[PDB]
Amino acid sequence: ATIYFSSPLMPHNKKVQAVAGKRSTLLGVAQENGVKIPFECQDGNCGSCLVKITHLDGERIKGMLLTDKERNVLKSVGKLPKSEEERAAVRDLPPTYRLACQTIVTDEDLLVEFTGEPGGA
Amino acid sequence: ATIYFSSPLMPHNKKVQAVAGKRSTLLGVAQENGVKIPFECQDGNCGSCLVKITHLDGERIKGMLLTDKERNVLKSVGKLPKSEEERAAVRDLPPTYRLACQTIVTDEDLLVEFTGEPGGA
Numbered sequence A, B: 001a002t003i004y005f006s007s008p009l010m011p012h013n014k015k016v017q018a019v020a021g022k023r024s025t026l027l028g029v030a031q032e033n034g035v036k037i038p039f040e041c042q043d044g045n046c047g048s049c050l051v052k053i054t055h056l057d058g059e060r061i062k063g064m065l066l067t068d069k070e071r072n073v074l075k076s077v078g079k080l081p082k083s084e085e086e087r088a089a090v091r092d093l094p095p096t097y098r099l100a101c102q103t104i105v106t107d108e109d110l111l112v113e114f115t116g117e118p119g120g121a
Ligand code: FES
Pocket: A038, A039, A040, A041, A042, A043, A044, A045, A046, A047, A048, A049, A050, A099, A100, A101, A102
C-alpha cells in the first residue's frame, strides 16, 4: 500500500510504502515513518489523530468502515460521512474524515492529510 | 510516475504508471490508458481537458508550471491558482487546475480528477 502523507507543516508530502494486513493503524504507519500526525489516547476517544483520507485507488465511493468510536468523535466535530448517494453525486472525489488510530492499513493507496494540530484544527 | 485518475464517471479510480523515458502529456497518459478525459484540440486552446491535479509526492505547494494557453483557459473558467502564500496557508492540500494536454508528465505522483464533461463542467 502506498500512502502519501501531507500536512501544512510538511514542505514536502511523504510517500510511504506500507505493508497491508498486520492490523497496523494509519497512525502507526505515520509514527513509523516520522510523520507527525498528532495523537494522544491512541484509542479513538480524544480525536487528536483526525485525518482527511482520499482513496487513491479502488472504489470511488468506498463503503464506510468507521469504528463506533470514530462515529462518536466525528459526530462531535461534524465530520461524519455523507451518505453514499451524496458522496456519489459530487464532482470532486470525496475524502473521508477518519481517526488515524482507528483506521486499519489495507491493500489500497491513500492520500492522508492532517493539519498538524491536534484534532485536525 | 504513478497517476491516479478519478472521475464521477469512473466507479473506481484508475492507478496508472506513466513510464520513464516517454515524453507524454497527462492527456496522452489518460488516452493511452483508456481514461476518458474529454479532449478536442490537444493543443491547450479549447479547454476540454481541464483536470484537477493533486500532487501526491514532492512539494506540498507547487510552483506554477502553467503554459500561457492554460493561464488563458483557467482565467476564463475562474480556476487560476491562488498565490502560493494563500495556498500554503490553507489546511487542505490545494489542488491545481490544469489542462491535461498541456501538462507534461514528470517523475511525480499525481491524483488527477476530472468530471468527464468537456471543460470539467
Ligand atoms: S489519538 Fe485519540 S483519537 Fe486517535
